[model samples]
Every structure is written in C-alpha cells, then in structure tokens.
Target: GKLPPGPSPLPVLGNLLQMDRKGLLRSFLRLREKYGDVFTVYLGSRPVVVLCGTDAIREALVDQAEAFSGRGKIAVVDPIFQGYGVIFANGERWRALRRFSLATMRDRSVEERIQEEARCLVEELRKSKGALLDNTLLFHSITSNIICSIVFGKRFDYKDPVFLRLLDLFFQSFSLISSFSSQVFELFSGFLKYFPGTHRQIYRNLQEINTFIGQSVEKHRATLDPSNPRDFIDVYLLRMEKDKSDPSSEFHHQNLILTVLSLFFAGTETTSTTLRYGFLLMLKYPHVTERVQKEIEQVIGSHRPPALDDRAKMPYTDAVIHEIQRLGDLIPFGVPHTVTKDTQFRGYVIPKNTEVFPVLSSALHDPRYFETPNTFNPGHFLDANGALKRNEGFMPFSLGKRICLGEGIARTELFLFFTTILQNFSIASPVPPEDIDLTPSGVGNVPPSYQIRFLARH
Candidate 1:
C-alpha cells in the first residue's frame, strides 16, 4: 500500500521530534492545509494519517466505518484507559459499552436531569452575585453533580471532600496529558510510571481514582436493589448477570468502574469548558450578550428556568451557543483512531494499523462551511427568518458510528446550563469587552482561561 504523503522524518521516531510540546494542534493543521487532508506523520514508530476537511472526516468515519473503528491513535493513554471504556475501547468492547451507556443514560433521564441540574447551577451563580466567578470549580461542580445523580443516586454538597477530590484528580490528569510534553515518558513505557513529574502524578491519581470508584461500587453492591436499579451502578450490576453469555458484553464490574470515570471526566470537562468559553465570549461582546438576553427573555421569560424543550423557541440563544462552540472550537483535535484495516483517503493509502486524528476543529472552523470562520457571529446558525439553522458540518459532538454516546446529554447540558445561567444573569465582563481573553486553558476542551467574571443583573 502507498503511504500517505507528508514530510519525511527520522527512521524510528519519525517526525515526532519536530512536534512542539505546545501548539500540537497547530502542527497538524498547517500540514493538512499543505497536504490537503490525509497526510501521514509519525509519533515514535506510529504512523499518523490525519484527515482534514468535513468531507474527508465524514467519509472516513461513516462510509468506511469498518476501517476507522479503532480508537484514535492515542498510544500512551491506551493502557490507562485499558481499552475497556467506550472512548478508547474498540470493536466488541466499544460496541457493547456504547449500547450499555446509551441505554443506561436513557433509563436515568440524563436529558431531563440535565435541565434540572442547570437550574441549580444558575442558582449557585446568584449566591455569588454573578460576580467574578472562577468557573473552574463551578463548572466542575455542576457537571459532577449530574454524574453524582446518575452514578451515586444523589448530589454531594460542593463542600464534600469526595466531590472536590474527584474534580482535582480528574483535572490534574487531564492537564498533564494535554501538556504533550509528558508523552516523552510514553516513549519509555517500562519505567514511564517511575518518572517524577506529570507521569508520576497521573499514576498516583489513577490509583486514587480506582480506589474511589472501587469503594463507590462496593457501597452500591452492598445496598443495590436487583428488581429495580437506583443508579448506574445498580443497572450495571443487573446487566452483568443478563449479558454474561454475549461475547460483546462489556458489563463486568471492572469495565463498569472505568466507564463511570470516563463519563465523569469526558462528559463534564468538555461541556463545561465549552460553556465557559460561551460565557467568556458573550461577555467579551456585550452587544452579543445583550441580544441573546433579549431573545431569551422574549422566548422563555425571566420568571423561571427554561427546560431542554425550550430550545425550539429560543433560536437566537441557540445561535449564540453554537457560535461560542464554533468560535472557541473546543477539542482542537478530534479523538484519535487507528485504522481497523488498510484503507485510503482521497488517493492516498492509509495502511492497516495506521493511527489517525480526524481533525474536527478543522470542520467547525472551516471557511467553506461558515461565512466567517474566525468571527463570533450567531447569524451563521440563523436562517433568513432568524430561526436556528442546522448544518451537517457543525459536528462538535463528532460523527460516524463511534461518535460520542453522550451527545444527547452534552446537547442537553449545553443548552440548559448555558440558557439557565444566562437567564438569571447577563454574562458580562468587569473589564472592557476587547480585554476579554478568549483563549482556552490549553486543556483538551479549550475552555476559556481560568478567570472570567459574570455580571449578575437579576
């Protein structure tokens, strides 16, 4: 098979050395522009075939599902994830986990509960006067509460040590992984864990997280009702019995623990980060925020929190949220995946076992898809009549069969949490509009930098 075209690199390490610790996304982006999507590079011995453009990603994921089914080529993280959870796991494990997660989320009312939890978040902002709130904690708390309700059967107080620690380790590991500098340890897999920095921190944090998940599972096991499951753990325990004979079953306790942790981290971090960016951008443009507020007030009224069902009536608010996600472009790199088998993109060969990153941000900010890719213009998502317009390329949730299982949940959270917060308060900056720094915190989701102040009016 012909190798996809790209700059030549070192024999073993390939072009891995040429990549910077920061600006990792920028590197792939520039290459795709030059090579026109489907170019191969190397990280250590790994062959990375990056697919850019909306058509390239869609065709690879949807038309060639069999070849693109493997999790993105995240070699270092594969072990920590253990290929059991939905995000990293592939083939039978991925299929089972996806079915189980989607089913369980349906049973738990993740959709309705999201709107309810969003109401609570708006109330929390009020206690702070929508004042200069460091959303790192608030977003962490709100997302955690949703997970708590789904997994543990109740929400913990913000002061709960368990709640705080969960956020702490989750963020700690996430930040370390995103640093990209830590991938050096992954090059030396044997002693990688012994390294005295981010690797060590990730190792220590994973152990603690496992213990916490184990304890939670044990607690639920001791008190669970078999006839009717109370939360996710109970449902998982019940399924373990019913699905033992299925070769694709991912219902065991170990997979259960990891899946719960994945949901907590992936679900909360991505959405909250995007929402954080949404608010930051809104504050940066008062005219934008004011127009959104006026639209929300007109559509949903100011007396009560809007529900997920209210999305249809609030086109302008919807447009603003989409614009925030589009402009901020959470998750600069789409999840990495390896080819399930040999394949081709355009005319280039994507050999079997090749790792690939289908760059979703490329699609989100694609100039061909939107009028002004760089601007924060809600009108991009609005029809001539000013209603929300749906575009196939606005794929923050991603595409193909392996796309996010929790997309329904993410949509609900973004819509409800953002609208709820905006309904109660106008997200304004204490500083002038132009002074707002809209850059991401350099984490995977690209949330606004840590300091954004919400100005409360109601």
Candidate 2:
C-alpha cells in the first residue's frame, strides 16, 4: 500500500508516544503542519490514514464518497455494538438501516417535538430567577426528551428518576469514550479489555442503557399497533414483521435494540454538548449574544416563542448558531471512516478496509475557509448583506454518506432553544468574559464547566 507520508513510527507503539493522547485533535493539527493534509500514522501496529483541512477531507469524504464510506473501527464501542447498529454496521445492513432511519426520522413530528422541549427548557431556566447555575443536566434532559419522544412515543419528566439515571449514564459513557484510557484501549483493544479501565465502565454503562432500551422495546412490542405506528420503535417493530420471511433481512430484535441505542446516543449528546458550548460562547462573547437577542426581538418578539420559520428571517441569530457549531467543533475527529475498497486518493493507494480519520475540527478551523478560525465570530457565517453565508468548512456534524443522522433535528433544536432562551432571558457569565476558558477537558471538544445567570428579559 502506498500510504501518505507521516512521522516514522516505532515498532508496536507506533506514533502513539509522539501524539498527545489528551488532545488528539491538537496532535493531528500539529502533524498536519509537518506532513501536510493527508498522512498515515500507526495506531499500535495498524496504520491509519488521517485527512485534515477542508481540501483533504472534502476530496476524500465528498469527492470519493462511496469508496470512503465504510465505517471505521471505534474500538471502545465496537465490541459491544459488534457491527450491529446503523452507526457501526456496513454493507447491506448499513444501507437498509440508513434508509429506514432516514425515512422514519422524516416521518415524525420533529419540529413540534423540539419546540415542545424548548418550551419546557425555557420554563425550567426561568425558575432559576437570575441565580448563577450549572444547567448541564437540564440541557441534557430537554435534548434527550426530544429524541425520547421520537423514539419511545413519550417524554420523561425532568425529575423522573429513571430518566435522570439514563442521562447520567450517557454523560459517563460520553466522557469515558473520550477519556485517555479509552484512547489507549482503542490502540490495544485485544490486550487491554481484560484489564480494569474506563472501557470496562463504558461497557457496564451500555449494559444498563441496553436493559432500559430492551424494556422499552418489550413494552412497545406488547402494545404495538401494526396499523398505526406511534414512534421509531413502533415503525421498526412493524418493519421487523414485514421482513420476517426474508432470512437476509437486517430487521430483527438485535438490530432494533442497537439501532434504538444508536439513535439515543447520537441524538442526545451531540446536540446537548453543542448547546452547552453555544451558551458558553455566548457568555464569553456577550456582544454576540446581545446581537442574536436583538435579531430574535425583531423576528420573534417577546409575545411569541421562536419557531423554525424564524431561523431564515434572522440571519444574525442563524449565523451566531452556525458560528457556535464552527468554533465548538463538537466531534473534533468524526467517527472514523474506512475505505470501502482499495482506492486512489491524492496519488496514494489506500488499501481496502484501512481506517481513516477525517479530522472534522481541521475543516471547522481551516484557515483557508475561515478568516478567524480560532475566534468566535458570527461574521464568518454572515455575508456583507447580513445573509447567512454557507461555508464548506463548517462541518461540525461532518459530511458525506455518514454525516450525523440527526443533523436536521439537531439544527432545529439549536435554533429554537437558542432563540427561545434569548427571547425570554438575557444570559451573563459569573466571571469576566476574558476569564472564561474554551479549552476542552478531554478528547471531545466539550466546554469546561461554568456558571451563568439567566436574567429574565422585561
């Protein structure tokens, strides 16, 4: 295989020592400086190609979309998922599930569900009464509820004990997945699984989540109405029956459980984390928040809640949201992708099934596309005429065949929640704007914990 050039790797350990395990995205950017856009680094003895910047990522993920569409190994979760769900599955299974998921998601009342959650979130925030607070759990619950409504046909109460535990598990699983222990486990999965580490805890968390999902699946099955499907699980249950005679069909109990888990995992945290970062950015950049609020006042006003329709009319608020995603860079290195076949890319022949990391943060922060890539600037998404400008570099949800499944719903939630909150309250940081830290705590680009005051707008 003619792999792209990169730092020479040591036997076994490969380039792991040279890379910063704590800040994998930073390490990729550093290497990109030395080796150019596309390069190969060995994780353990396995050589993995990395695509950085908009040009390299777009060329591979977009231009060569099919050949690069394969789902790469996510060692921490792969054992449990075992290529079962839409997110991890490949070939015919992926195609079938992907199609079903897209259709199912499209059929639901997504906007209304999100709007309902947004209203609940606003009322919850209002209860704080200008007191400095950490509202991480509240954001998680509201975001999770939107997905819950779509998947389970019901929303959990904010104080529901079962829902709270599930949310905590998700938070733990997300943090564990991005922890240094998980990174080490990814490189040495075969040897490290037997040892006690964060990966073990992730497995335990998944089991708990799986049990809850299983219970829901059983409940949905017992009360299923083939004539009228209520939610995602219902639709899937109906599909399973439709495909029951086809021995080759991927629609089965295992697939249903894992697919629902995939929806919950993908649907919940990514949007919630982005919301968290969005608010943190607002706190740091008070002027940006004020401008968005002004845009909200003009487009939505205090008498009404913000709606999806208002997003198009309010370019500044839209731009601010897009800018937050750009700088947030939530999934810095998107779920790794693999070459579906031996393919030529940038004059190098990457062998079939080789893992590739499409560094999304590189594109999000690509200097070529963004003038001030590191800074929080809503102008990046606003044209001279104050219209929302589409930048190819803004790929927080990633791109190509494996783009985030919940992209549409996530966008709706972001716009509605953000604008609705700003419409009802003015946000202020407890510390000075300059004192706020944007540095991520781990592999994931999560904003550091902070407190804020949401004063009611008169």
Candidate 3:
C-alpha cells in the first residue's frame, strides 16, 4: 500500500503518544502543518489517511467522490451497529437505507413537527421565569422529541419518564463516546475489551437506547397502516413487507432497529449540541444575540412564531447561525470515510478500505476561507451590504455523498428554535460575556456548562 507521507510509528502504540486527548483537532492541525495536506497517522496498527483543508478534502470526497464514499470504522459504534445502518453501512446496504431514509425524511409533516417542537420549547423555557438555568437537557429533550415524532409517530412530553430516560441515555452515550477512555478503546480495541473502562458503559448505554428503539418498533408494528404510513417506522415496516420476497433486500428487523437507532442518535445530539453551543456563543457575544433579535423583530415580529418561510428574510440571523456552526466546529473530524477501491489522490495511492479523516475543522478554520477563522464574527458570512454571503468553507454537515442526511431538518430546527426563543425571551448570561468560556470539551465540540436567564420579551 503506497500511503501518504506521515511521521513514523512505534512498535505498538503507533502515533498515540503524539496525540492530545483533550484537543484531537489541534493535534491534527499541527500534524498537517508539518506533513502537508495528505498524510497518515496510525491508531494502533491501523493507518488512517488524514486529509486537511478544503482543497484536499473536496478533491477526494467530491472530485473522486465514489471511491472515497465508503464508511470507515468507528470503534465505539462498530460493534453495536456492525455496519447495519445508514451511517455505518457501506456498498449496497448504505445505498438502500440512505435512499429510503432520505425519502422518508422528506415527508412534509416533518416541518410541522419541528415548528411544533420549537413552540413547545418556548413554553418550557417560559416556566423558568427568567431564573438562571442550565439549558442542556431542555435542548436535548426538544431535539430528541423531533426525532421521536419522525421515528415513532409520536412526541413525548418533556417530563415523561421514558422520554427523559432515553434522552439521558443519548446524552450519556454522546459524552462517553467522546471521552478519553473511548478514544483509547478505538485505538486498542483488540485488548481494551478485557480491561474496565468507559467503553463498557458506552456499550451499555447504547444497548439501553437500542432496547428503547426496539420497543418503539414493536409498538409501531402493532399499529401499522400500510396505505397510510404515519412515521419512519410505519414506512419502513411497509418496505420490509414489500421486499420480503427479495433475497437482496436490506429491509429487515435488525436493519430496522439499528437504522431507527441511527436516526434517533444522529438526529438528537447534533442539532441539540449545536443549539447548546450556539446559545453559549450568543451569551459570550451578546451583541451578536442582540443583532439577531433585532433582525427577528424586523422580520418575524412579536405576534407569530418564526417559520421556515421567514428564514429567507432574516439575513443577519442566517449569518449568525452560519458563523455559529463554523466557529462552533462540531464534528471537527467528520465520520470517517474509506476508499472503496485502490484510488490515487494527489499522486498517492491509497489502498482499498483505507480509513480517511476529512478533518472538517481545517476547512472551517482555514485562513484561506475566513477573514477571522478563530474569531466569533458573523461578518465572516456577510458581505459589506450585510446580506448573507455564502462561504464554501462552511461545512458543519460535511461534504460528499455521505454528508448528513438530516441537514434539512437540523437547519429547520436551528432557525425556528433559535428565532422562536429570541422572539419569546431576551437571554442574558449570569456572568459577564467575556467570562463565559466557549472552549469545547470531549470528542465533539460540546459547549462548557453555563447558566443564563431568559428574560421574557414584551
């Protein structure tokens, strides 16, 4: 295998010693500066080709899209999903589930569900009565309910025991998956299983989540209506029946369970985390929040909840959201992609099935793309005229065929939930804006815990 140039690895540890557990993206950036855009790093004995910057990533994921579209290993999830669902599955299985999922997610009712959730979230926040509160679980509950509506044909009350428990599991699983112990498990999976660590708890959390989804699936099956499918589970059950005769069909019980689990997990944490981080950024930069609220006042007004239709009229809000995603830089290292075949990229031969890291943070923070890559400035997405200016480097959903399937839903939720909250309440940080820390913790860019008062807007 003629892989790209990278630092030499040791006997067993590989490049593990060089990695920063707290700031993996920082480590990747430093490595990129030394080795150039395309380079290799080893996790245990496994070689992962690291692609930095927009040019290299776009070249491989876009110019040579097919070859680089295969799903790579995610050690924490691999054992549970085992390449069964859309996110981890490759080849024909990925194609089928992705197509089905995209079609199912396109249901027009999804927009209404998000809009309803946004309203519900506003009401929930109103109960705080301007008291300083940590909004983490509130954000999680709202976001997860949207997914519940899609997958189970129903939404749960915020205080429902089952709903709260599932949300807790997702929250715990996300934190654990990003924990240092989980990273170690990914690197040394061969022997790490025999040892005690957070990975064990991670697996148990996932198992509980799976069980919840399984129960929901059984409930959906009992109430199925073939001609009038209500949610994703209903449509999938219909598909499973239709494809029963086909030996090659990807629609089955295991795929159904895992796929529902995939949508649930993916849909819940990402958008919620972004909102959590985005609000933290708002608290840190109250001026930005004020500007966004000003835009909300001018466009959405006080009488009505913000709708998707209003997004086009609110350029400042749009730019602020874009800047939040860019600086928030969630999913800094994208879900790994693999080479489907022996492919030549930038004059280097990457063997089939080689794992690749399209380091998304490099693009989001690349000096070539943004004027102030590290600063939290919405102007990065706005022109001199103050209109929303599109930047190619803004890739929170990643790029290529495997780009986030929930992009549309997530965007809708972000806009509606954000604007609705601002319309209902004026948020104020408990501490001074400068004192609010925006440093991310864990594998994903999870916002540091903070409290804010939601002063009701008159």
Query: In model 3, which regions exceed 4 Å deviation?
Result: 21-23
**Whole-model Cα lDDT per candidate?**
0.75, 0.87, 0.87
Identify the superior model by lDDT, candidate 1 or candidate 2.
2
* Model 1 clashing residue pairs (backbone): 71-337, 72-336, 72-337, 73-337
Candidate 2 lDDT tens digits, 1-458: 49999989989788987787456677777888899999998888888999998888999988999999999878998877989989999989999999999999898479988888888877888888999988788888988898889899999888899789878987889988987778878788888988888888888899889998999999999998899999999999989888889999999988988998898778877888889999998988888888888888887888987889888899998888898888888788878889999999999999999999999988998888999999888889989998989999988888899988888989999999998888889988768998888887445767788888889988
* lDDT of candidate model 1 versus the reference: 0.75
Question: Clashing residue pairs in candidate 2, if any?
Answer: none
Residue-by-residue lDDT tens digits, candidate 3, 302-335: 9988889999899899999998889888898888
TM-score (all chains, Cα) for each model:
0.93, 0.98, 0.98
